[PDB]
Amino acid sequence: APGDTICIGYHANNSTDTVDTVLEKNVTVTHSVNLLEDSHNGKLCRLKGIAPLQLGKCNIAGWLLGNPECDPLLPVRSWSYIVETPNSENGICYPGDFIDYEELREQLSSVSSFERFEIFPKESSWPNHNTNGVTAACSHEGKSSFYRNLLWLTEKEGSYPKLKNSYVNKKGKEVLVLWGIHHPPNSKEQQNLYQNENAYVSVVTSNYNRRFTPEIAERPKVRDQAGRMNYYWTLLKPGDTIIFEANGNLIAPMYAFALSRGFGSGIITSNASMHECNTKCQTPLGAINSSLPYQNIHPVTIGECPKYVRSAKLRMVTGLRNIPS
Amino acid sequence: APGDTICIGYHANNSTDTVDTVLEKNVTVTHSVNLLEDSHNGKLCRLKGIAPLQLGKCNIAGWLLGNPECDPLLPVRSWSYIVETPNSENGICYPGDFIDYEELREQLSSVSSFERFEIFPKESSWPNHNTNGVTAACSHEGKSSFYRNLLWLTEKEGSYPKLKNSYVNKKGKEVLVLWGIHHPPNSKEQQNLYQNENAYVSVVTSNYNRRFTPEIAERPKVRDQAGRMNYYWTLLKPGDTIIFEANGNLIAPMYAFALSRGFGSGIITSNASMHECNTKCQTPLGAINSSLPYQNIHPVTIGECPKYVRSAKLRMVTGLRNIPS
Amino acid sequence: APGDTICIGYHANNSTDTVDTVLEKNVTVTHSVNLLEDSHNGKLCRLKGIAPLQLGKCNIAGWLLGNPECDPLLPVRSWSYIVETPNSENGICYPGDFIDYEELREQLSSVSSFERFEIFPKESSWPNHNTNGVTAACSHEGKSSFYRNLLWLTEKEGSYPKLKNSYVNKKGKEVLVLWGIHHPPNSKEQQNLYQNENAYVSVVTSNYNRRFTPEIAERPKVRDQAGRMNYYWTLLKPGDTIIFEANGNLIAPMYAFALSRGFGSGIITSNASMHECNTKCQTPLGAINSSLPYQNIHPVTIGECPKYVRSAKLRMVTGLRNIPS
Amino acid sequence: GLFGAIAGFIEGGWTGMIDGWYGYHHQNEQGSGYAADQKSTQNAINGITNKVNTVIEKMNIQFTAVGKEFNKLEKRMENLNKKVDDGFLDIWTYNAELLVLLENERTLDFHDSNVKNLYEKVKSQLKNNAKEIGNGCFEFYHKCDNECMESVRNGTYDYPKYSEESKLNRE
Amino acid sequence: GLFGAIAGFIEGGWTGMIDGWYGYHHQNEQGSGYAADQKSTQNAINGITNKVNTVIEKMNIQFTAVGKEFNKLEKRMENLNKKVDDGFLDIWTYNAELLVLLENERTLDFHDSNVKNLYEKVKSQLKNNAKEIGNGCFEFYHKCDNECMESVRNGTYDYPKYSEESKLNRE
Amino acid sequence: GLFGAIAGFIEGGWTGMIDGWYGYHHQNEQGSGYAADQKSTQNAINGITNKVNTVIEKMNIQFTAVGKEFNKLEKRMENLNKKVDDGFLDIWTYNAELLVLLENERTLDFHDSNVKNLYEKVKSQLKNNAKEIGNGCFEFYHKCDNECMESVRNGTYDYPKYSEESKLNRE
Numbered sequence A, B, C: 001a002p003g004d005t006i007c008i009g010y011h012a013n014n015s016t017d018t019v020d021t022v023l024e025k026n027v028t029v030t031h032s033v034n035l036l037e038d039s040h041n042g043k044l045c046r047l048k049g050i051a052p053l054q055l056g057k058c059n060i061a062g063w064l065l066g067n068p069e070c071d072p073l074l075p076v077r078s079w080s081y082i083v084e085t086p087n088s089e090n091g092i093c094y095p096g097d098f099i100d101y102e103e104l105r106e107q108l109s110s111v112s113s114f115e116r117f118e119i120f121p122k123e124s125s126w127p128n129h130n131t132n133g134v135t136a137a138c139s140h141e142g143k144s145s146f147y148r149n150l151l152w153l154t155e156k157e158g159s160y161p162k163l164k165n166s167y168v169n170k171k172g173k174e175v176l177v178l179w180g181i182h183h184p185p186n187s188k189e190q191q192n193l194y195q196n197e198n199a200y201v202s203v204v205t206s207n208y209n210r211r212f213t214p215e216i217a218e219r220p221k222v223r224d225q226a227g228r229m230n231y232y233w234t235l236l237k238p239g240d241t242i243i244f245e246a247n248g249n250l251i252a253p254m255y256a257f258a259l260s261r262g263f264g265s266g267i268i269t270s271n272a273s274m275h276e277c278n279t280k281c282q283t284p285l286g287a288i289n290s291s292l293p294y295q296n297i298h299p300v301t302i303g304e305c306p307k308y309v310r311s312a313k314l315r316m317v318t319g320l321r322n323i324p325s
Numbered sequence D, E, F: 001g002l003f004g005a006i007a008g009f010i011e012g013g014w015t016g017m018i019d020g021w022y023g024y025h026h027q028n029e030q031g032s033g034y035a036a037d038q039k040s041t042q043n044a045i046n047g048i049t050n051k052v053n054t055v056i057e058k059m060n061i062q063f064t065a066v067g068k069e070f071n072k073l074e075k076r077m078e079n080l081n082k083k084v085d086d087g088f089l090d091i092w093t094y095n096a097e098l099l100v101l102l103e104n105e106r107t108l109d110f111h112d113s114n115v116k117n118l119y120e121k122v123k124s125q126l127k128n129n130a131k132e133i134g135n136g137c138f139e140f141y142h143k144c145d146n147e148c149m150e151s152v153r154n155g156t157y158d159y160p161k162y163s164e165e166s167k168l169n170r171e
């Protein structure tokens, strides 16, 4: 007999996992850990128990001005992130420029809730002025309409008196006020609606001070409109007063938004649909349920997410080189 | 006797230093080097032998306009960095907008010295105009006052003649000129001070060209003032001329600043106090005297400083695993 | 005899290459690979078979406005990158402000081709207006001239009729339109050229809407001119209409540019000269022909280039420590 | 490998050893079987676990990161924002892949070192009471039962106990 | 080095061996000469080649990157752009130099490990049929011709064939 | 450790050896004492010193870096500035901690390798004139005085000088 023997050896198994090293690629190993998350549920979920704000057919501009083609939201909403559909068919419907529109979007990125309230009641705030002005540019059910948050002031009985209206912010939170300035394409329309040629609009607060004058010129038709409406906004601090002064061309605010600030929010564009689910991490493609450090799903993330990388694979070896032969 | 023996061994001692490795944490080792600086002297020091500029109760806006509540500095100062106290109770005292204020701050970040000089002498430059206008918004010792660098021009004997004044930059350095535009809350005050309704202010240089018109409207009171003063500035290149033209509402410059450019400067906010010390590295919390590559004291640094990191500890092992047993 | 011997050893040679390691510097090794590219041909080359656009004596502003001192380019050009000489002696020749000039430069960074065409023919578009206005500020061969792409409209036979001209973009690509606004230094010159005091200029498109008014004031002379010309631009989308309306002070467009968009382009400043060569990577110092990952030639790169680093040397060892002794 | 044990003088691994990464196979008159070395296997588990957790811990949680909008006259700022986002993405992708590659080579060598150290530990225990028959095996010059085998698997082999026997067989 | 072979117990390299990085030098009655070990040399070439390509591949192609212009009232944005450009440049310069330094130490140790493994492979093949005369050389206790030398250079040395001879010379 | 010397077959360190990191302890009829190996200790000092300086040198001097101000209508630019500052801070904190961790493991292994190489250097010098009694000690088969001990501490041990004696004691 050869005699008794003792041998030193190492483990092997039927694993087919492969990793790369600096010296050699495609190494079959006994054990390994995947560090790259690539799976998502393909749905829009609640974030930390809070549902997002879905604007549906509207973009931010369409919702804030109150486009009549979009389903109206509840007067009070609270959310964790904002979703815009890729096909936002409803935005600004009367052609014009939305001044500092992008800055207003970034402001809304840190907003957690809004309350929609009548800053200037329709049948209380504008005596001696017509408030029924509509347009085919903002249609609703085949009929001419207007923004739900604004009021087109025009002449009443051959005159447009100099209006002077003000609101004191008593809500205890910042209040977002939006208004418009109309620019007729010819001076004949300027008299018909506002009865004054040297019209002006003045909007003042403690930290806002701007004056607007109509600019009259023939323009290419946009949405069958040769006129233009410039949209403006400001954030009224708690306890502050906003004063509106005009003798024409003012698209007066009617509804305003009391806003609450929050953390970790943002605006994303998603084709996905809302579902009854909860996640700690949301992407425009779907929600991630992972404790892994990396992900290659999407760079846009809401919440507590793995770091986005371009890698196709990140596998760390923990076991040995697998040699079952 | 067993016989003579020789043995190979390694050093050990009474050191209690610990480092972390990738495979194992909290390793007691014989020798190590700390690479993370966490100590500062808690004082505001001179940088490379040059003292900083301490504005005291003023911020940049309060010092540049000459707020009367702040102690006046010497006519000529040279510094390595600028310090603003966290509680800057004195800034703009007459309510209004400081146009491009942030840009002016970044300009001052590369400035090493200023000379304050009378660009438009008070009793020489404005005949036929009253220059004694004061306000309770900018008070001093309980009495109404005004900015030390500006002059409130008003009507003299029932008239406000069209002024035309100019200055040629003969200082050999860039000259910072500041002026204001006053906006009365009602047209009655516009006539009382300036005697003209269609007033305007024109300021021109070789590369600056702007016109200002008053905008009259009732406004919420700020610092017991319903009027507004908009503040403006430009940098007059060496050899260039600035021309002021107005028939009202001009808050004329009286003093200006000849500026020298520098390197490595900046503006910081600090609660700390000036001391008789010198350092190569200054932070808002204090000064660092270190040749280590990293520091976790503060991300805001002036001079030659270690790189700021969030780490609590960065200890590199140089000796061996300590096994004194 | 000692007996037969076998020995294990390693290669050595006459190589003098040295590399650095973490533990020891200046290690002579048998084989190594340089990873840092430091060689360029010192010439301006074609990029992927496409020649750059050399503006010669002009900068972007001088070429776009049509400075008469610069050699005119062909009506159609296509390029891979844009070259400006360090000494661009010809830019804006009539003093004034080029509004959003930097933004227009970044627009041109993604442009691959232009077509220069007469948007408003000189002898067809402006009846009842004089179009022969010239100035000594923009000289050519010792005689007063004007921009090649603009037209100085002035009064004709004691009057300046309100002009109304429009162009419809039928080129199928975006069209760059440039115009100027003249500001006389005194009202006497305002009447002499334009016969109106309350003059204005209106320029409108589907997404552009601006009005310009002259601002009259004495100004320091720049290039022997106390007047100012403000230059403006907009991009007219395919199928859109631009309408010009003025009763004075309009420096009308005469030529415009139909632009094609591209990728990988940019604007660089180079002292180098064009040569008959082709490269995949171009720097302001010269062209790089390398498959190495790093380069320390220049941070400004066009095309497919190695990554710029500050390192003086990056040598990776592949062989052994060289011990030929 | 770097230490010459795995895929070196021990050519293959043992599918029959399921308990641990490293261990022993014995053959005596009482039978044969596999037995993992719990001490060295457990030590390697803890180090690699700390090593995995170190990589995960160094990567912070990615909090909310969304896009921004810019108008037609803010192309410069838009491109700067894109340059920032792409630049950070370039660096983190480079760091993640490289760290995994560098650390994978270290793990394989770490296992390679452990096998050699275990082999060397047994060799110094047995001395000349057994012979190196290659492939990581020792042929005993003496009868070694289950109790004797266990004394080799732990660190309590009595060399003087079997030295007199082993010398006779070694002759 | 780390494994003690290169610049260690084998003091110098061989200028006469031009074929490969590692190999053998033999001396018998038929003559002498150098001969590289193709198996271990080729293996080291492939690993280092993959290692070089890994470094180059991890660095992406630098596409177009040019400067931008800012007017006199955009100094803040200009400084932010400069801070971005300098910051990215600082990081990539740090990554490139450090990776080369760290990897250079690994390459030298990788060669050092290979020499020791080749030396140990021959030592376990010869056993006591030759003696370690230091400096990485073995003195045979038996006549070893060109065919015998080739059997050592590859892995087919017949220990029982020359054991009886070698024992007599070893005495 | 990786090379099996520190916390391996040499279980503990010597508090009595204050001169250097590695060295020798001798016991003969003339007495006993500790003695550090200056050659290997000095070599390890220089490499680690260059290694420390390399880390410090790769980190550039942090020149002036201050905050910036933005008005209420520049929130986008303010957030981009914050994203830049945080991003660079994230990367440098990651680089600093990881480099220290990776390099700390290398230092411990570097010391581990040095101890084994020193132990192996003495073993090849003594050959069979002494016996490995474990724990990194050699028991001489011959009388070895202070002069003889010094010849082992440096690289000048005369094996033929004591071979005849050692063979008799080894018997």
Ligand SMILES: CN(C)[C@H]1CCN([S@@](=O)(F)=Nc2cc(Cl)c(C(=O)N3CCO[C@@H](c4ccccc4)C3)c(Cl)c2)C1
Pocket (backbone or CB within 6 Å): A011, A031, A032, A033, A034, A291, A292, A318, A319, D018, D019, D020, D021, D045, D048, D049, D050, D052, D053, D056
């Ligand atoms: C995904 N994340 C949330 C992280 C979070 C932390 N890690 S963790 O460190 F725990 N990962 C691992 C760490 C390891 Cl050591 C191992 C590992 O090889 N074996 C662990 C079990 O005994 C080994 C074995 C040996 C021999 C025979 C049978 C079995 C296998 C594995 Cl499979 C995973 C996961």
Ligand SMILES: CN(C)[C@H]1CCN([S@@](=O)(F)=Nc2cc(Cl)c(C(=O)N3CCO[C@@H](c4ccccc4)C3)c(Cl)c2)C1
Pocket (backbone or CB within 6 Å): C011, C031, C032, C033, C034, C291, C292, C318, C319, E018, E019, E020, E021, E045, E048, E049, E050, E052, E053, E056
């Ligand atoms: C520049 N880039 C485009 C990259 C792209 C990829 N690399 S590449 O990996 F191929 N580089 C090298 C990789 C290596 Cl292994 C070697 C190397 O040491 N020897 C290769 C030839 O046998 C060696 C030899 C040994 C003994 C005697 C004689 C010869 C020498 C070299 Cl010199 C370069 C280059």
Ligand SMILES: CN(C)[C@H]1CCN([S@@](=O)(F)=Nc2cc(Cl)c(C(=O)N3CCO[C@@H](c4ccccc4)C3)c(Cl)c2)C1
Pocket (backbone or CB within 6 Å): B011, B031, B032, B033, B034, B291, B292, B318, B319, F018, F019, F020, F021, F045, F048, F049, F050, F052, F053, F056
């Ligand atoms: C802080 N910075 C400005 C940097 C700048 C550069 N470094 S530096 O490289 F010099 N650092 C060190 C480098 C080292 Cl090797 C050591 C070290 O272990 N010993 C050095 C003295 O002999 C060792 C010893 C061994 C045995 C018995 C007694 C003593 C201890 C130390 Cl304590 C520090 C510092």
Ligand SMILES: *[C@@H]1O[C@H](CO)[C@@H](O[C@@H]2O[C@H](CO)[C@@H](O)[C@H](O)[C@H]2NC(C)=O)[C@H](O)[C@H]1NC(C)=O
Pocket (backbone or CB within 6 Å): D146, D147, D148, D150, D151, D152, D154, D155, D156
């Ligand atoms: C190491 O293994 C040996 C071999 O089994 C152990 O020693 C025996 O332990 C058993 C306990 O079941 C006793 O009955 C025997 O008498 C022991 N034999 C000898 C020779 O000591 C030993 O305990 C083990 N050491 C450990 C586990 O630390």
Ligand SMILES: *[C@@H]1O[C@H](CO)[C@@H](O[C@@H]2O[C@H](CO)[C@@H](O)[C@H](O)[C@H]2NC(C)=O)[C@H](O)[C@H]1NC(C)=O
Pocket (backbone or CB within 6 Å): E146, E147, E148, E150, E151, E152, E154, E155, E156
């Ligand atoms: C390893 O080397 C030995 C020594 O040369 C080779 O064995 C000899 O191969 C030749 C072929 O030219 C035969 O003529 C001899 O009869 C062989 N001798 C013995 C003892 O086998 C062997 O083939 C080599 N193995 C390889 C290359 O795999």
Ligand SMILES: *[C@@H]1O[C@H](CO)[C@@H](O[C@@H]2O[C@H](CO)[C@@H](O)[C@H](O)[C@H]2NC(C)=O)[C@H](O)[C@H]1NC(C)=O
Pocket (backbone or CB within 6 Å): F146, F147, F148, F150, F151, F152, F154, F155, F156
């Ligand atoms: C290595 O150590 C030996 C042992 O001491 C040294 O050799 C002795 O050196 C002394 C010098 O003081 C002489 O007096 C002895 O005659 C030497 N003895 C022998 C046997 O040579 C040797 O010089 C040392 N080598 C060095 C330091 O390089």
Ligand SMILES: *[C@@H]1O[C@H](CO)[C@@H](O)[C@H](O)[C@H]1NC(C)=O
Pocket (backbone or CB within 6 Å): A014, A015, A016
């Ligand atoms: C390995 O074998 C197990 C049987 O326990 C089986 O379930 C598993 O699918 C196998 N894996 C591979 C990769 O073959």
Ligand SMILES: *[C@@H]1O[C@H](CO)[C@@H](O)[C@H](O)[C@H]1NC(C)=O
Pocket (backbone or CB within 6 Å): A018, A026, A028
């Ligand atoms: C990686 O290795 C496995 C197992 O040998 C093999 O099936 C697979 O094709 C390899 N992949 C490659 C070579 O890309």
Ligand SMILES: *[C@@H]1O[C@H](CO)[C@@H](O)[C@H](O)[C@H]1NC(C)=O
Pocket (backbone or CB within 6 Å): A289, A290
């Ligand atoms: C998320 O992952 C955890 C971990 O396995 C799991 O327990 C939980 O059910 C998952 N939640 C999902 C998929 O909604």
Ligand SMILES: *[C@@H]1O[C@H](CO)[C@@H](O)[C@H](O)[C@H]1NC(C)=O
Pocket (backbone or CB within 6 Å): B014, B015, B016
């Ligand atoms: C180590 O001992 C020295 C005595 O020389 C003493 O000064 C020092 O404080 C001790 N350090 C520790 C950590 O015990």
Ligand SMILES: *[C@@H]1O[C@H](CO)[C@@H](O)[C@H](O)[C@H]1NC(C)=O
Pocket (backbone or CB within 6 Å): B018, B026, B028
């Ligand atoms: C680190 O090790 C020391 C020494 O053993 C010990 O006192 C200390 O508590 C340890 N720290 C831990 C386990 O966090």
Ligand SMILES: *[C@@H]1O[C@H](CO)[C@@H](O)[C@H](O)[C@H]1NC(C)=O
Pocket (backbone or CB within 6 Å): B289, B290
């Ligand atoms: C700064 O550190 C150096 C280095 O020790 C020291 O000599 C000097 O006195 C220190 N200066 C201080 C603390 O002001």
Ligand SMILES: *[C@@H]1O[C@H](CO)[C@@H](O)[C@H](O)[C@H]1NC(C)=O
Pocket (backbone or CB within 6 Å): C014, C015, C016
């Ligand atoms: C090495 O020798 C070769 C001869 O083949 C010679 O061409 C080469 O220049 C030499 N290189 C150095 C660095 O001496």
Ligand SMILES: *[C@@H]1O[C@H](CO)[C@@H](O)[C@H](O)[C@H]1NC(C)=O
Pocket (backbone or CB within 6 Å): C018, C026, C028
């Ligand atoms: C690097 O080493 C070479 C060869 O020994 C030497 O000629 C050269 O001067 C060294 N460079 C230094 C020390 O900077």
Ligand SMILES: *[C@@H]1O[C@H](CO)[C@@H](O)[C@H](O)[C@H]1NC(C)=O
Pocket (backbone or CB within 6 Å): C289, C290
């Ligand atoms: C670019 O480099 C390649 C690679 O050697 C070479 O074949 C080609 O001729 C070079 N082209 C030049 C220098 O224009």
